[PDB]
Structure formats: structure tokens, C-alpha cells
Design a protein around this ligand. Sequence first.
Ligand SMILES: O=C(NCCOCCOCCNC(=O)c1cc2cc(Cl)ccc2[nH]1)c1cc2cc(Cl)ccc2[nH]1
Ligand SMILES: *Cc1c(COP(=O)(O)O)cnc(C)c1O
Ligand SMILES: *Cc1c(COP(=O)(O)O)cnc(C)c1O
Ligand SMILES: CC(=O)N[C@@H]1O[C@H](CO)[C@@H](O)[C@H](O)[C@H]1O
Ligand SMILES: CC(=O)N[C@@H]1O[C@H](CO)[C@@H](O)[C@H](O)[C@H]1O
Lengths: 787, 787
Amino acid sequence: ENVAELKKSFNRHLHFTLVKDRNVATTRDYYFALAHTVRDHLVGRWIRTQQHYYDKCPKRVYYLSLEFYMGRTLQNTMINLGLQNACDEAIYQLGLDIEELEEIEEDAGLGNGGLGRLAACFLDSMATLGLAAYGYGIRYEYGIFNQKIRDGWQVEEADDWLRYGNPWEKSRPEFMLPVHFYGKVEHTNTGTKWIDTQVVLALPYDTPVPGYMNNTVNTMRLWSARAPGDYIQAVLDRNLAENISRVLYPNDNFFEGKELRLKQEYFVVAATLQDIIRRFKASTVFDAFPDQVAIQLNDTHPALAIPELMRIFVDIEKLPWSKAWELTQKTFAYTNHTVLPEALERWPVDLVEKLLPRHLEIIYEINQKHLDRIVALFPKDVDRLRRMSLIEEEGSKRINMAHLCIVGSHAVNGVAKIHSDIVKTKVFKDFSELEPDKFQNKTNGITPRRWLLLCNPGLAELIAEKIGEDYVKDLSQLTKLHSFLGDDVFLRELAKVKQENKLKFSQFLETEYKVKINPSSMFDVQVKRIHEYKRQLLNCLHVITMYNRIKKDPFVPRTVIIGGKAAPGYHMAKMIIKLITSVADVVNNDPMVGSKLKVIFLENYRVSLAEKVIPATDLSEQISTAGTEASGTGNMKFMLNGALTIGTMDGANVEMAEEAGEENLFIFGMRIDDVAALDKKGYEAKEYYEALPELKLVIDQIDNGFFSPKQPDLFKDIINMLFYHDRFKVFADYEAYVKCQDKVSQLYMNPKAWNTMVLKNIAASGKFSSDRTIKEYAQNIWNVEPS
Amino acid sequence: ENVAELKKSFNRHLHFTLVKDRNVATTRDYYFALAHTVRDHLVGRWIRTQQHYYDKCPKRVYYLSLEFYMGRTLQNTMINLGLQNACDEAIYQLGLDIEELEEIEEDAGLGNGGLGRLAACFLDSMATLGLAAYGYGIRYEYGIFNQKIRDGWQVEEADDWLRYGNPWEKSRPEFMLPVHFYGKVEHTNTGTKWIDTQVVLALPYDTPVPGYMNNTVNTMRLWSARAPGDYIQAVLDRNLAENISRVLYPNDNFFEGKELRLKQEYFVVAATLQDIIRRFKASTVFDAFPDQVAIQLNDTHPALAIPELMRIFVDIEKLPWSKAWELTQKTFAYTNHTVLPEALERWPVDLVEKLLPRHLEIIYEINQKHLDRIVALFPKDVDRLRRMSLIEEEGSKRINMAHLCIVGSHAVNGVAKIHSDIVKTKVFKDFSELEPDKFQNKTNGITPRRWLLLCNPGLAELIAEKIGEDYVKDLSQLTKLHSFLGDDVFLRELAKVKQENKLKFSQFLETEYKVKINPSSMFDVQVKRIHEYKRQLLNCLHVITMYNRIKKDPFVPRTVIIGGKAAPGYHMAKMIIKLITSVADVVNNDPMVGSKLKVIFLENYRVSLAEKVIPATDLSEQISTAGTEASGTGNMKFMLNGALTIGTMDGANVEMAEEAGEENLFIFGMRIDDVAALDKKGYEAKEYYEALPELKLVIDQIDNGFFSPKQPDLFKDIINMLFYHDRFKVFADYEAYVKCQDKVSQLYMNPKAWNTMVLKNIAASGKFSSDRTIKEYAQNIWNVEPS
Ligand SMILES: O=C(NCCOCCOCCNC(=O)c1cc2cc(Cl)ccc2[nH]1)c1cc2cc(Cl)ccc2[nH]1
Ligand SMILES: *Cc1c(COP(=O)(O)O)cnc(C)c1O
Ligand SMILES: *Cc1c(COP(=O)(O)O)cnc(C)c1O
Ligand SMILES: CC(=O)N[C@@H]1O[C@H](CO)[C@@H](O)[C@H](O)[C@H]1O
Ligand SMILES: CC(=O)N[C@@H]1O[C@H](CO)[C@@H](O)[C@H](O)[C@H]1O
């Protein structure tokens, strides 16, 4: 692992692996040569790590998720293996730019946003904590679509990230497994039998998950679907079975009850459980299963894992229901990341019956023994029963997957105090009252490797020089930065790092779009999925408000960046995008405003891009309506990277305030109980429209066509929603939000005070390391021990 | 290179490439570890070879084919690189069985039979002759289907040979190209424009083609098709564009006018020509094109290459029609491998118009200037015009692709004297009369590497010890074996080699099927595609005839093996298969016959299997009806491997007779003119049925249900065809065939005489080396020079 050997290895791969020489080698060839050179360093530890788990048999943790928002692997692997500087040097000496090589790698965007990214950070933390952890998901041929902007609107493009091949995956053919669909049930004397099913093969692909500087390399196993004139059609028709793992459903906090999606859910669940059972057996027999296996259900998407495990225990392993049921509960733990009713997974019974007849039976059975227990405890409370039932039958009966996850798991957790409380005491009150100890909180976290050492080497280096490198593995150590609260030199060094990041990102912005970026402008950014509850619409109102101010009285200059993908079928989100692009068009071109204000819709927001924009932001927008963001994680990334936060008391924003002190965050707007009171009284949007002149103008402008002269009624739908159907009370926080924004500008005029607040935020980031999050999961849910 | 290094390299790959250790390594892992170890030895020479072609710029030969029946690559690569014994030793010392490892490799069955296999042998010979040759085809995700037998019938199974990955291919992303379909034509002032087309991307995959012991490694470039709620459907729909390179049409000598097939034809043609143009330019400008490029059209399947080249020259390179046309003719050469009218490619104009509007125009244009030339030469001969037209308009006009290939190429060749004569003087008489010198003959050949050194190391070794190793590169040297005609010891050594092959193959047969093989029985085999013209039906009649003889007078024992795949939609071929399996069932089980006669339908006949069965055969069945097999190549494989031939004077069978002397082949049946006379007089099948008692019985038995008691009328269709619609006069050769068969048995009773004839056959095999075939193509068509 010295420069000379890394270089010879690079040349060896370019030659034998890419079949190229320096004469005709492409940039892609160089990236691959480097990827392979780095990859070779993972094998030894990967083999030894998995060997170790088999020998020592520690309890294994299986993170079952439909999403793994991994991003790029090259740099992350180099850093965790402590190879980055040596590789950087090797590539430099070969006359190549390692950064250009790194940009060649496609993001493994097998996730939509927060949920999927949390799984990625967890895999990193679990490997860094030396846990015998495994990630189980689907190897979508197409991840979250690539987003482009045409005439101001979002346009989707298929993300075939595997086009040129993925060097970071290793197919494991010997572990292929069959998954069954449809067919019918038969209750023979030899047990229940699911027959006449269609079979789809599940081919596993393993991706190494290197812990940070610790010799352990865990595994992320993703399953790919494979089929088991007229002849030609039959061959072509193999595409149907393979379509199961073809595309990631692009919905963020929205349930789409498509049959193909249900197929994916069962697919990953069936293959995973079988693979887990097989491994357990390769280690009466299943009495130790729960002590050797923990399966975390990442949201209800893999809820079917409960009846599937039961199906395996009962129909296959011939275990009695009672025993199987206890083993099941001991095995599963469920994490709730949802709050919005539209995000709730509720599969119509008819669909499940046709696709998974045996599972429906097992679910009715579970529900039966579940309700019999309630009736026994509350003989008279009838509403209780249909309220706690796994089946809701109000015209088109459907299965409440969350309820199934609650009864089939020994632990249920929310992802932030405020959220876990709501989940426990409100959403699933009937359940928590019966099983208090079942519900928990596990406040989310982000990995400080990818989200600091990787994306912000400048900040990482500065911090390291002041307090050592212990913080990488123990982020709580960041509090030591408090000793520099008075250190003017340090405060200057901190701001410089931010400046460099902003300068670097500004070049990016300029090369990508025709807009001159004011390098000294405050970087105000809101990057996250486009959704009404996240309210980038409110941000847009504020942008317009600032525009009207400059026009009226021609101020802290700022570059307002808003980015995020909208689900293809999410109409309002797409309108909001067009709204933002429209507004940006007028503001960026109005000569009167000039360099005072610039607006950018950051296109194709994704993990690798987040790694670029976050380190360069000054003001982080986390303005969801109180009670809507279960937790949020971008908020944590911004905090860790030197940005101040403007947001509501929602999700983890609350805990960020607790950690750094509420005065060091720009909190504003209604709080959960405030929103409750307004719903009580009834929300009348027109009220604020009338009482708020700056607001009225903004609205009139967008509704009049000021931002769409060639098509004056373009934003009609947004207006109507905002006035008669805004479930997220956008106008209700407008004033508080705008006032808060001005305060931010005020502080920004004072570099010493601004960076002093930044330091307090960075120094209080510790809690938000996913390492801390995983330790809690390990200790209070999986009953597992680091290393 | 040496055993020690090959072993360390093997372990290195098992580790870094397969991520395995000896503990959990699978047999597949070992195969891959070895494949990679061997593959590394190809790179140096591969890079240097292609570099050399660029520097020295020799004229390049492009073999354009829809099929490349490659078989397995491992052993063939080891042999051509002179690494087999060293690798054998390495693997042995590692405690592994290299043969078991080799059996893991999937056949690259991207061909149906002879046509596709000829392309494979040619690539081998061209690389061995040091020609700057390239193979251009399609990388079908699914090759010729795997054939299984269920209840006696052929059952097809998708051949996903790429399931576990192909180590022998290297994707060349930087060379991806777009291919256009549909759209419409527009004749603008800036030239003709094909617009509003659908685009399919062509991704090339390169496979190395090592010459035999000569440092040159050529390239076989195969193209894969790639696409350039509602969103989900759109992504899934990408499968449509990708279906183009999905499956190989499983037809042998039969034209199926499916639109998807036409798509494949244009696909490979468009990508290839573009790739060729690009390379030429990377070397007024196109004046030297014909002197730098030769494109061999493997049958009419890639006929579209002619109008496509014209399209490129005219619509894109802006060359005047006249110039482009001359350059085109000088570039293309067409090989005709068809005789059967059903195999003739005739695309309906409407289909071509919709899919390739611009090409239809270019074809009408070609035809126009073509017919204007004829009218000018033969002002009165009207029938001449519609006889030589590229378009035949008898209700549903269609394009005669053969005619297009004839006018667009400077050379047209058949694949055997008898065939080339028929093609020249009969099928395309009107054309040859105008351009005598255009038509040629290039008798087919097989590579003595794969078909001797590889498949029959025993025979190869024996021959080498007697006459040296010069024959591998100059098969004509086999004539030296004539010096051993009296050598009893040698004759014994030769028979022993055959015995060993038979013993080895017998083990195979026994492990695969429940049938005790008489090791001393004569191995009578007919392996080739199932088709009425190939007449395995006649062979079946003879098998039944022998059965009835044993039953009557309870003789040289023999194992009759018949194998071959039937096109899925070929009804009669499938019936014939069931007929053979039915017959085998009764004969193998009749206790009276016992070990006197055994019948085996060799399942899944393919290249790797041919390499096993051929070296073990005594009697090679090449009984097509005179005038039906353009050439045949299995006939050559059997001859080279020590088998005697029983066949008609058809295709290359005639030249085999010329080479070895007709008395050394068991020729029989009607000859071309005999068949002509019978057609003249009119074929009355019933005649022989009446006059031939042994025949009548056979027929009565099969028609009565003797071979299908549970379903007496099963073979009705075969009976009817044989009596009223047998275009291949099966009964007409029955007697001559049976008499001939008896003579074979007679000779077989005399080991010295039999092997003496075998020696004369092997010693006269020389001419049938594809090296000789390629030399002729190079000298008289491509104007290229070996080495
Ligand atoms: O395709 C080629 N190279 C590209 C890289 O190969 C892709 C398949 O890789 C081999 C299987 N191994 C893995 O996929 C793998 C190893 C591995 C190790 C780690 Cl630690 C993680 C993931 C991993 N994946 C290729 C090279 C080449 C050279 C000649 Cl002469 C002929 C054909 C050829 N093809
Ligand atoms: C972290 C992250 C998210 C989650 O962002 P929130 O603001 O917490 O919704 C979404 N997308 C990407 C690409 C991320 O890296
Ligand atoms: C050589 C070969 C053929 C051609 O056989 P003929 O008997 O010449 O038709 C067909 N299939 C395979 C697998 C071959 O090896
Ligand atoms: C279903 C879903 O995608 N939920 C998302 O989960 C992540 C990870 O817990 C939270 O940070 C976020 O607030 C929430 O919107
Ligand atoms: C259309 C087609 O596949 N033709 C086949 O081509 C091969 C190669 O020339 C001949 O040997 C064979 O007799 C002939 O049937």
C-alpha cells in the first residue's frame, strides 16, 4: 500500500483488466483501473471478516430495506481503508487527475432520499462498529431517475447506472434462490402447500462495506430478478419476471399500490429470509434463531417478511404456530419513518390474495389471534378491535402493513424524539398502551466519513489539527471545538474552509449554468426531495419577497439554491419546480437586482451532488411543517459542515436545537401543538393573504402571470392549493419565516458572530453521527455488541 | 507461463477476482480463476496485434454474420497459446480436475449450425493465417436454445449463456453507436434525410480470437442492443429496443420473415458499417476504401449492408451515387449457403418500407439502374427483367435479398463445387452469364485446431508422432500418413485411439442415459440439425429395418446415435425426433435384440458436444438428398477424426470422395441428375413401399402404432408426407441406402480393412482445413495476404 505498488497495480489493471494502454485508454478506463486497484485492498479483509463471523458466530444484524442510497464507492473506500493520500499520489505521478477519475463513477442511487440514505449511513456505521451486519435490498437495474430541466420543468431520464458495469459488486451465483408468486393454497395432510406458483429466480450480488479504519468489511447483498414466433415471444417474455428488480419506485413519502411494487417487496423479502435461514442452518434447531438473527424492517416496505418467516417456519420447517410466532417477534424490529397518511402502506386484500394467497391466510391468522387478545382484554371496547386490526374494511378491504409490523416485531422505533413520541402516544396509542416497552426512539444519524471526511476534507483537516482524529470514530468529541470559541484565528480558518468550498462549488455552478455567482454571497440552500410538506414553496415565496424588496429599494447578497427531485406522478411538486425555475429566470435576469440575488434550481440532486453543495452552504433550509419530517438527515449534514440552520421545530431539528442551544439555530414558525390549534380552529389561508402585504404581492404576481407572462394562468393549481387545500399551512409560517430570514441576514453581516454560531453548531454535531445511532440500535434492539 | 507462475496467478484470481479461498470456492469459481489466468496471456498479443494493423495498415477483412457458433473458449485458447499442458499441470498440482473445470463453461452458441460454425472456424483460420480479420455479429443474450427431451419430444429451454458472466468478452463502451429504425424520408436541398426515427444504441463487446501458435489475436466484435405508473412503464419499455439482440432466431435453412429478425439484420449491419467507416477514417477520401476494406456477407442475412453503405456514402459522406456504387461493389463479396427455396430471404416491401424507408428507396434505385442495364443489353427479353429484378411482385411484393447481394458485390461464392456450380449455372444463370468471373467456389473447411487438436488429442498426438506437427498449420501434410498404409502397428494404434474415444464417450452416454453401451459396437452417428432434407428419417427407417432383422433372425452390433435440434416451429422435424425416440425406446428395451443394437437420440447437440461425439464415431451419416446440402461441415469433422462416411454425392461429400477416392467412402443413392429425372417422371413414393418388403414393414409398423401403441396414429403426419409430400425422396434412396449400410457392416467385421480405409480418409482430409478455405478467400476475393 505504497505509491510505487499502487501505480504498478494500476498499470496492471489498465492492461489486463481494461485491455488498454496509455495511448488509447479512456478516462473511464482510468477510473476502472483505479477502482480495481482499490478494490483489491478490500478482498483480504472481506474474506477474513465473513470468515470471522462464521467462526465466532456473533449475532447477525440484517438490515432489510427496499432502498440503499449508496452514492459513489471509490473515494469512500479509499478513505475507510486509509488509501486516499497514497492513491492520490499514485494517480498524480501517473499524470492523471484523481478528481476527474472520481467523477466518472455513477451514483448507486438505489434510494429516493432520506430513508434510503439512512440505510447507507447505517451500513457504514455498522461496519465501522465491527457489527456482524448485512444489508439486504434489491439491485435495481435503474435507480432514482436522473433529473433534467427542460423549459423550466422536470424531465426524467432512466438512470442505468450499470451501463458500463459495476466494479463494486460481485455476483454470487451459487446463492441464487427461487421466489414464488401467485398460485394457490392447498391444506394437505402433509401440511399447507402453496402450489401452481410462478417462479422468479433471485441472484444475489454482494458489495463490500468497509468500516472506517478497522479491518472489517461487511456485505450489502442486493437481489436481481432472473427468469427460471411463439418460441421467440417466450424468450422475450422472460423480461416480465426480470422486470421485478428493474426500477426503483421513485416515490418519497407516498404510497403507490402498484402490483409490481408489491412483487418487489415480496421478492426481496423471500430471497432474504431464505438466505438468512440457509445461513443460520449452515452455522428445536430454530430455538436459537432469535439469538443469532435480528432483522430490521426499514419502514413497512418489507413488512411481508413477518408472514414469510412464519410461512417458512410453519409450512416448511413444520414448527407449531405458537413457537414460530414467538421466534418471529423476537427476530423482527420495525422502524417507522412515516407520518403522512398518503405515505401509509395499505395493500388491498384482493391484490395480496391473488399474488400471495398463503401470506394473506397467514396475515388473517395473525390478525385473528391478535384481535382475540384484545377482545379478551377489552371485552366491551369494539371500536378498539377495528382500530387495531391489520385489516381495514371500509369499501375495498386493505392490509395496514404498519400494524402487521407492530405485532410481528419486538421493537418499534421512530427516528427522532418528537416523531417517536407521536408514533407511540398518538398513531399507535392502542398498541403502545398494551406494550409500553415495545416502542422506542432511535434518533437518526449520518456517517461522518462520507458526510465530513469525504465531502469536506478541508473542514475535516482543520478540525483534526485542532482536536485530533478521535472524532471520526467518536463524533461527540467535536465538543472539544468549544475551546476555540474565542480563538479569532480559528474562526478565520473555519470561514476560509467554507469560502474555499463555496468557491469550488461556484465554479461547478457556473460551468453547469449561465449565471455569475457572487462568491461573497450567502449560500442559502434547500436540497431535498420536492414535496409540499417540505415546503420549498415557502422558500420560493421568500425568494420572491426578497426580489420585490430589491426592486422597490434598490442588503446581504445571497445565492438561493433549491434542488430536489419530484416523483414523476407528483403534479404539485412538478408545478413547484416550474415555479422555482420561473422565479429564478426573472430574478437572475433582472438587471436591477444584478449580483444582489441569484437563484439556482440545483438539477439532479443526489448523493454525489449533496457531497458538493452541502460543504459550500451557509444557511440550511429545514422548513417542513411541524410534525411532518419524521426526522430529516440533510439537516444533520449541513450542521456538520459549517452551515447555520433556519427551520421549524420538527423532526431532528428539535434535537439539533437541544444540542447546540436553540439560540444558535434560526428556529421559527408554528410548533406541533400550534399546528393542532390551527387545524382545530380551521385553517383559512386567505387570512394571511389579506393581512400580509408582502405576501399578497407575491401571490398576486405568481397568480397574475408576472413569473409566466407567456402563460399567465400557469400556476393556477398552486394558487388554488395554497388557498383552499394547503395541508401544510404555507401562509401560516410565511411571516415568522420571513422575519427569521431577515435575522439570518443580520447575523451574516457580522462574520465573527456568524462563524461563532457555526462553531457551536459543528461542536454540537456529535450526537448526529450514525455511529451513535447504531450503538443504540445494537444495545436496545438487536442486542448486539460493537466488534 | 511456467507451472509455478500459472498456479500463483490462478490463486491470485481466485482471491482478487472471485473473492474466494479454497474453503468456499465453487467449481465455477475455479473455472473462472483458470479462465482469467489464461485470458491474461491474450492481452499482450491482442493489443500488439491491433496496434500492428493500425501501423502497417494492411487491408482488413470484415466477416459480417448474424451467427458465430463459437462453442467454448478456455481449451481452445490454451491450445492456440500453447498453454494447455502447463495449465493442465498447474491445475493438477492445485488438486483440481481441469476437465471438470472446463465442463463449467457455457457454449457461446450464437449460431444454428453449419453457417454459424463456418464463421467460427474462419475466425480461427484467419487469425492463424495472420490476416487483419474481424468478426462482426450480434451478442444475443440467448443463443440457440438448450434442447431437452420430455416424453420423447423436443422441449426448448432458454439458453442464457451469460447468466454467470462471460470472461471472454470485453465491452467497448467508447465505441457505442446509434442505429435508426422507422421514421420517414425527406429529400431536402441539403441531401436526403431520414428523420423521426427511433434510436437503438449498439454497444460492442470484443472477444479475442487467437491464431494457432503465432502471436496474432484478432477480434470478434458482437453488438448488444441498448435503449438510448407511466414513468415505470417507460423504463420497462426500454426492453423493447433491447429485445433486438435478445435471441438468436433458431431456424436452420428456413426463412422466417419476422419484423424483429429484420431489425436484427439492420442492427448488426448499421453498427458494423459505421464502425468500419469510423475506423477507416481514423487510419476522394473513400477512394481507397475498397483497398483497405473487404466485407464478406455470410449469406443474405446481412444483405442490407449494401444499401446501408450506399446510404452512408450518399446521404452522409455526400458522394455521388455512381462513385459510391462502384466503391460498394468493390467492398462487398457474397457467400451463398442456400439451396432450399424455403431458406430464401424475401422481405415484403411493405415491411422494409415501414422499418427502413430510406433503404427501400436505395434498393429501388439499385434495381432501377440494374434493370436499365439489362434492357439495354437485352431489349426484347422481358422475362429476363422480372427474373433479374431485386423485387418480385406476385401478390405482396418482396425483395429478393440474394439478387441484391449479387449486384452489390464483386464476388459471389458457393461453399462446395457442386453447390457453386448450381448457384452459378442454374439459380443465378441470368447473372453469371453477364458476369462470368463474378461467381466462384470456395469449398468449406473446418479448423483442425478445434476439430482435431482440441477434440481429439489422442489422434492429434498419434499423427504428430508419425509425421511431425507441420500438419496443424498445413493440413495437406496429412497425406504423409499414406506411408503407413501397410504399417500394422500404426493401424492398431489408430484403432486404439478410436477405442479410447468410444470408451470415454460411452461413459458419457451411460451417465446421461439408462442404456448399457456395447463398447465394441460400431458407432453409427448422424448429428446435425433436424431437417427433412438431411433425412435422419431415412436413417430411422434403416434403424427399424435392422430391428426387424434381429427380431426375425436373432450381425455386427452397433450403437446408432442421432442428434440435432429442431427449429421450435418445425413440425415435421419435431415429429421425426419423437419418431426416433419412440423407435429407440422399443429397440433398447426389446430383450431379443439386447446388446446387438442400441439407439440414442443425442440431446442438446451443440459445438462442445460435437467435440465429444465426433472423435468417438466409426460411421458418419451424411445422407442428405443429392442437391440439398450446399456443402456440409460435420462431414469433414468426422473424416478428420477417424470415421468412415456413408453418404450421397452431395455438397462437400463429393470432394471428400475426390480426395480420398470414392471407394474409401460408402457412397450411395441418387445423384443430382438422378433426382432431376425422378422429378421429371414425377416421384411416386408408394412405388417403393410396394416393391420393397423391408420398407413396407417399417412403414406399416410406424403407421400402425407399433412404435406408439398408446397412440397408434401419432406418426400420421410423417406417413402422409412420406407418401404424398416428400420433397426429399426418402423412399427413393432407401434400398441403395440399406444395401450400402450392409456393406459398411461387412467392412467393419474386418478391422484391418476398416482402419486401412479410415487412414486413407484421414490422410486425404487436408483439403478440408478452413485454413486452405481462407487462403482461397484471401487470394481470390479479399485480395489479402496471410501473415
Ligand atoms: O470484461 C473484462 N474486464 C472487466 C472487468 O471484469 C468484469 C467481471 O469481473 C470478474 C468477476 N469479479 C467481480 O465481479 C468482482 C470482484 C470483486 C472484489 C471486491 Cl472486494 C468487490 C466486488 C468484486 N467484484 C475483460 C477483460 C478481458 C481481456 C481479454 Cl484478453 C478478453 C476479454 C476480457 N474481458
Ligand atoms: C441526505 C439526503 C437526503 C435527505 O434529505 P432531507 O433534507 O433530510 O430530506 C435526500 N437526498 C440526498 C441526495 C441526501 O444525501
Ligand atoms: C459442424 C456443426 C454443424 C454442421 O453440421 P452438418 O452436418 O455439416 O450440417 C452443425 N451443428 C454443430 C453443433 C456443428 O458442430
Ligand atoms: C418513508 C420515508 O421516506 N421517511 C423519511 O425517513 C427518513 C429516515 O428516517 C427521515 O429522516 C425523514 O424525515 C422521512 O421523511
Ligand atoms: C442456410 C444455411 O445455413 N446453409 C448451410 O451452410 C453451411 C455452410 O456453408 C453448409 O455447409 C450447409 O450445407 C448449408 O445447409
